[PDB]
Structure 1
């Protein structure tokens, strides 16, 4: 499922994914939690993102 970033996000660790507002991100894993594993359709990188920064697209 594809979500779209509502805000910019700047990563702070090894495992999260930076992204820009409007970037489209594929869900890799959102089975549970506030942090989701996502895959960017702009960069192709995969990492954890804050779920409250994205909405379905």
Structure 2
């Protein structure tokens, strides 16, 4: 399942990942809590994204 960003998000540090609304992600870890480790299908960048900012495609 891919996930798609509902809103733009600007990351605070190198650990979280900035993204634009409509960006799609493949999710690598969702089991660690509510920030999921994800790779952007736009750029390939990988980092934590807030799981409440994305929805399944």
**With structure 2 as the length reference, what TM-score do the two structures score?**
0.94
Deviation beyond 3 Å, 4+ runs, structure 1: none
SS, match of residue 52 in structure 1: helix
Q: Which runs of 5+ in 1 are unaligned?
A: none
Two-structure CA RMSD over aligned residues (Å): 0.7
Give, in whole Å, the separation in 2 of the partners of 1:9 and 1:43: 15
**With structure 1 as the length reference, what TM-score do the two structures score?**
0.94
Q: CA deviation at 1:31?
A: 1.2
Give, in whole Å, the separation in 2 of the partners of 1:20 and 1:28: 19
